[PDB]
């Protein structure tokens, strides 16, 4: 489980390094939308929720917004693209603290390919 | 029964070596979607469940997502392609632990053909 690392300014902006053999722990609180933003030029193919009805998915290019629309919304999201496949573990938080407003990925595989 | 081997980072990402004379034990828990991903350039012909109503099947090219949609969903999935035929033993888990988020195949037959 990748648990994303918060920024130094605000704890609502979190950073995680993409690893193809690991999943990302997303803590979604009630009534906020989480901005998940993919790599530049990455073409989204398909996704799949554990519950299509627990979470709301909106995408515009490489910008993905999710939002819990039901109680006890514990599922997983697997959004697959041309380059890689992202696996998230959406676990709803019960006290509406410690939200995540934006998740941003650091890809070391593309940096290695550049190296 | 091939029982897939977990990754070293997360136990939700599992790897299995394709063997034409053996079936794969898939442990599907409630409310997660399992990503089953076929070989590159492999053309999907047909599939067949034990229960079409116990499991939900979505495919986009070589990406196959399944998800249990009923209680006591113990069946088998036989997805046949141009090159080979995959036989899975989908057995629903009752305590919603030890999920499988992604199943990935290692083909030794194509490596042998390259050898």
């Amino acid at each position: 489980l990748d648990v994303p690392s918060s920024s130094r300014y605000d704890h609502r902006i979190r950073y995680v390094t993409y690893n193809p053999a690991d999943v990302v722990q997303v803590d979604t609180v009630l009534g906020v939308a989480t901005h998940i933003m993919l790599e530049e030029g990455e073409q989204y193919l398909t996704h799949a929720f554990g519950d299509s009805e627990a979470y709301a998915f909106a995408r515009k290019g490489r910008h993905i917004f999710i939002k819990p629309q039901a109680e006890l919304a514990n599922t997983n999201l697997i959004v697959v693209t041309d380059r890689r496949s992202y696996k998230f573990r959406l676990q709803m938080r019960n006290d509406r603290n410690g939200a995540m407003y934006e998740l941003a990925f650091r890809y070391p595989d593309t940096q290695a390919r550049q190296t | 029964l091939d029982v897939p081997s977990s990754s070293r980072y997360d136990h939700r990402i599992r790897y299995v070596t394709y063997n034409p004379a053996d079936v794969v034990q898939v442990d599907t828990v409630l409310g997660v979607a399992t990503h089953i991903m076929l070989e590159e350039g492999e053309q999907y012909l047909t599939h067949a469940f034990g229960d079409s109503e116990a499991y939900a099947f979505a495919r986009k090219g070589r990406h196959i997502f399944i998800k249990p949609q009923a209680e006591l969903a113990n069946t088998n999935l036989i997805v046949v392609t141009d090159r080979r035929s995959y036989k899975f033993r989908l057995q629903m888990r009752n305590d919603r632990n030890g999920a499988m988020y992604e199943l990935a195949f290692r083909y030794p037959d194509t490596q042998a053909r390259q050898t």
Binding site: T46, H47, A48, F49, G50, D51, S52, E53, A54, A56, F57, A70, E71, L72, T75 | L30, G31, A33, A56, A58, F65, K67, P68, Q69, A70, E71
Partner: peptide, 19 residues
């Protein structure tokens, strides 16, 4: 119909992708 039971039924009913 405890909330856990309602969640379990919702998990059963929902499809992979909405719409």
């Amino acid at each position: 119909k405890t909330p856990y039971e309602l969640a379990r039924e919702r998990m059963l009913r929902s499809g992979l992708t909405a719409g």
